[PDB]
Design a protein around this ligand. Structure first.
Ligand SMILES: NC(=O)C1=CN([C@@H]2O[C@H](COP(=O)(O)OP(=O)(O)OC[C@H]3O[C@@H](n4cnc5c(N)ncnc54)[C@H](O)[C@@H]3O)[C@@H](O)[C@H]2O)C=CC1
Ligand SMILES: NC(=O)C1=CN([C@@H]2O[C@H](COP(=O)(O)OP(=O)(O)OC[C@H]3O[C@@H](n4cnc5c(N)ncnc54)[C@H](O)[C@@H]3O)[C@@H](O)[C@H]2O)C=CC1
Ligand SMILES: NC(=O)C1=CN([C@@H]2O[C@H](COP(=O)(O)OP(=O)(O)OC[C@H]3O[C@@H](n4cnc5c(N)ncnc54)[C@H](O)[C@@H]3O)[C@@H](O)[C@H]2O)C=CC1
Ligand SMILES: NC(=O)C1=CN([C@@H]2O[C@H](COP(=O)(O)OP(=O)(O)OC[C@H]3O[C@@H](n4cnc5c(N)ncnc54)[C@H](O)[C@@H]3O)[C@@H](O)[C@H]2O)C=CC1
Lengths: 315, 315, 315, 315
């Protein structure tokens, strides 16, 4: 068919949810690729039955062969590790895994360059703002054809927690988190709206306080940790955020979505990837939007980029 | 069933599209009521076949009997006239029809009070900010259970025209139009955002000019006239706006949506209906939001209310 | 974009509903073409506002220029007349309009051949089994790239009326109507199922009688007439049936759908179009399914083809 | 709200997918209940973020307290074990776990009877045709308010495998599997259709052979085992099948769906639960459909019931 071909490089917890949502939305044929033998065939078979319940017609097939990248329209990379082996859940962060996940990105980039150089790529593997640039360099793809997950996920949390306090539809809260995904993410209080109205109006009316919002900000930064400490793992919202990005691409919706992208002067920064609103459509990254940040907000953005540069050197 | 019962009081051009979208979305059983004999049975029959294509199960039935209001969960009022008889398309506006449409609202309010006093009501008949209050008074329903169409429709236009210039997803433009539906509608430049970012940033970047935006504002105010002068009539977007409101109610989405509602001190005004953001959920109008307007914006709001009061006196 | 381009050749009652449903489903960009000046621009403008309510991004534009066929992926033809001028609603049928609608198909086929020879075509104009073949011959397109509306619409009626009697989901009734669209349509009692079970089981159980089913058959054949006699016109279900066909094509769903298609030996017949189940996907008509009819059912099929051949000669 | 409250009794692999699909479809508020501390709070938090991406408004909350059953509209039971501890993946089946899962059903039935006696119940825990009856007896609910998962899932497999061979939309294959869920499931060759046409027509045409269909039948029976042996586990299709059932209930769709239900004379059998087509709407099990099986098919149904009776005695 001229159905899109979507290759999930990595068939773990995020991979399984992505496959499920692609069939629900009838977005295209799916390949679950992994290095683990047999497992991706098992998940694919299970998932393929749901075409019946969903009134869809998407193939879902497993793969242990890199050459099945051939002909891909969209490549989604989750391959790598989720925790360090021998650290505890209380101390979960990023430093020894870096050269190893570097190696995985380099291997995957080579297979992309050979098999699907015209594919649109989404990178997920952490630390994402480092790994996305490494894959960019080794795959050879144009700068408008590769992005990383960060802001759609981080803002989903902030938007959701505010909507519960104000008793409004979650999607009616808009908000911006920039710079990097991780503990230096920059939460922009000045860019939060409710039904398109400045959040400051709701603060002046005593519907939500400054102190409540400080606690929600800390909650947003520490959410992945909060979920690990409740004896679970974040993969459902991560999968839904990635599928919103891939769907904007495939259907040429042109949504404004905060993603990691090559900076060429925005915010003062070049030769690095960082999180900012972009427009995603049929030509990929159609527009990179630069927020007109003030000096206090710029100083936080600078701290986030410096941490990406630090980990890049260790990779 | 405990399926919702939705009674469309008026089975004209807007009525037919509403029925179509209710079946597409499987929102509830539908009654097409009108004073014209047989016609609502014909439209209902046609529309009922689409359950097959849509995988829905909504009854659609016509009615020429007011007592079929009994048991309604939602009542949508389009009944009345669309043009004055003997004015031309160039001079389309509001003044001789007012006592006549007054009479129609009074008759309908009596049948509501008798047959479905606990229904949620949406009024459409023009001039809407006058007719909604008349129906409120004659039906006896609580102030949180009746609204008028205006701002969802007017802002759909403004949001759409800006999104075409900036090349972004239409729903990513948010904007506010308040006070009344009609030629005195108040377009608030300061409350426009794109992907949650102040529109002023896009003006500073020369992506859209102040002059372009002035022309888009005039276009928005004159859209209903522009469509009449192209040898057609606005009913498709009006139907879609009303169904977004009714769906927020029925599914308890709690969306922020600009509608006509009883003012009790907001903006300085009492004892009148005017357009403002509200929250619609299972308890009806759950919240009335007051924008913190400046004195220049308040002065325009005052002009809009004064025109509703003028036409109310003539009704 | 590589968004599909869908050109609606004819912007009347069916055209307006098709445009609405394409935006609801985000299926592609839309052109409303007609010979009436200005009207298609008016309908397009109205419809374009609904992208906001629907969270879609489909352009909708009017046209009075045939060359806007250039680049079309799908062409849907409703152009022509709906009643004869000077016959009454009681005597509604097909004979004086035939050479005139012949002329319209010939003109449209020439513009297709010049501007979009690789488009997938759906013909609606009545009498459909005649007009579709005329357009096939004058447009030059391959036999797997042109079909006519009939069976999806006719069976929607039969399926719906049975589902109301048995109190089951409308889409759980399956049924076949073949040969031609119109008063000689062949309703196949032996091929009706409910939840995939032979309808005869429900007859043996007295849940529905043979006599009830005879009355439902007559109702199905006379539905378009029943709607005309209730002071309305069938266009909503016709639009929904056509969009189910076009959506199967565009999304490569491969649904089994009864349409008018070139016969090459099925049922004994060649060199004519008639209604039969086909499979619609990305390569168009992927399969033509021949029902293994008995001699009594074949004799009714023969009567339907003979009536198409009669009207073809008069065209 | 009068939003439905859906309590998932069991927050394992099937539970997590059900919660995800409920938010995607905006079906109601969700409680993830389990005996494992903290884990259901973690999964709920992750899942709650997806309201943003989905434009939904469903609460998702964890629970370790049985009394949170209070006010439930729908109760879905997955609680229990998935494998026996100390058997291998090659020998996966049903016998030592039975009294233990008996105990779990009895405990859950007591809490239902106290907290939500008017809830609609779906039982999943294996062996399902035994566990559903045990829960029926201990919960006290009416026979039209409790069902077990089996046939929607088993037939999803058979329908899907046939659709891949014939190259048609998966949902266009209809088929029936009855009696019990498990190795004695009864696959009815005579009740298979493609686009509502008897499958025998496609066999006469050599599009699919009798031998191919025998291999597909064996594949369908052994699918859960095939997935275990590929180093994965079936939970995605099971979750989608259960949500199709619960959605038919909540929205009064009245779909025909094969489920485990109390038999009162159908097929010769009373005082036991077994798989058969039923109609699910707002009053629960609205109709129990008895297939007019022949003596050879009845003999297989009898073997399936005998195996449910055997395991019931050991419980
Ligand atoms: N950017 C973001 O906003 C977020 C990123 N993540 C990251 O996503 C990644 C995946 O998370 P989960 O799916 O939960 O991990 P997971 O461990 O369940 O799955 C990862 C899979 O990658 C496979 N793999 C290893 N090398 C491979 C190769 N060369 N090719 C293909 N597959 C390979 C593993 O066998 C495993 O099945 C992690 O690095 C995690 O930290 C998680 C949440 C958010
Ligand atoms: N508030 C808003 O944003 C908008 C309001 N409108 C208004 O909506 C109204 C309807 O517009 P259209 O449907 O295009 O009009 P339409 O004329 O096509 O339909 C109105 C229907 O009301 C019927 N009617 C008259 N008295 C009735 C009664 N007592 N009970 C039931 N039916 C009765 C008529 O027979 C007719 O079928 C008009 O007043 C129009 O100006 C239109 C667009 C937007
Ligand atoms: N095949 C089927 O199952 C069905 C077929 N129909 C047929 O569909 C056709 C359309 O029905 P409606 O939309 O209700 O008709 P309508 O009369 O409302 O619209 C037809 C439009 O075609 C336009 N037209 C005439 N010549 C044209 C040209 N050369 N190029 C473009 N436009 C041209 C007219 O100005 C008009 O706007 C009729 O022939 C009708 O009998 C109706 C129902 C079902
Ligand atoms: N009927 C059918 O068509 C199918 C049935 N199943 C069955 O579904 C059941 C669940 O399967 P999975 O979710 O993959 O299992 P899973 O083991 O991942 O989850 C089961 C959960 O039940 C919990 N649990 C134990 N006692 C409980 C109690 N008293 N209250 C609440 N939670 C309790 C466990 O801690 C666990 O989290 C199994 O019995 C399995 O065989 C699986 C597929 C199909």
């Amino acid at each position: 068919a001229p159905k899109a071909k979507i290759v999930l490089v990595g068939s773990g917890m995020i991979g399984g949810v992505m496959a499920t949502l692609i069939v629900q939305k009838n977005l295209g044929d799916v390949v679950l690729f992994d290095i683990v033998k047999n497992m991706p065939h098992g998940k694919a078979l299970d998932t393929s039955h749901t075409n019946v319940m969903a009134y869809s017609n998407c193939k879902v097939s497993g793969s242990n062969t890199y050459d099945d990248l051939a002909g891909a329209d969209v490549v989604i990379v989750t391959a790598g590790f989720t925790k360090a082996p021998g650290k505890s859940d209380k101390e979960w962060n990023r430093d020894d895994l870096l050269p190893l996940n570097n190696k995985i990105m380099i291997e995957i980039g080579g297979h992309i360059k050979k098999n699907c150089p015209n594919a649109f790529i989404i990178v997920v593997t952490n630390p994402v703002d480092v790994m996305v640039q490494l894959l960019h360099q080794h795959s050879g793809v144009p700068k408008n054809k590769i992005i990383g997950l960060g802001g759609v996920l981080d803002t989903s949390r902030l938007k959701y927690y505010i909507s519960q306090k104000l008793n409004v539809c979650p999607r009616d809260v808009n908000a911006h988190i920039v710079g990097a995904h991780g503990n230096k993410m920059v939460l922009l209080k000045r860019y939060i709206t409710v039904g398109g109205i400045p959040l400051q109006e709701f603060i002046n009316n005593k519907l939500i306080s400054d102190a409540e919002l400080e606690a929600i900000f800390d909650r947003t930064v520490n959410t992945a940790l909060e979920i690990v400490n409740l004896h679970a793992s974040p993969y459902v919202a991560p999968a839904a955020a990635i599928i919103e990005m891939a769907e904007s691409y495939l259907k040429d919706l042109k949504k404004v979505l905060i993603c990691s992208t090559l900076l060429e002067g925005q915010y003062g920064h070049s030769d690095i990837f960082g999180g900012t609103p972009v427009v995603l459509g049929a030509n990929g990254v159609e527009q990179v939007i630069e927020l007109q940040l003030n000096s206090e907000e710029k100083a936080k953005f600078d701290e986030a980029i410096a941490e990406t540069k630090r980990m890049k050197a260790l990779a």
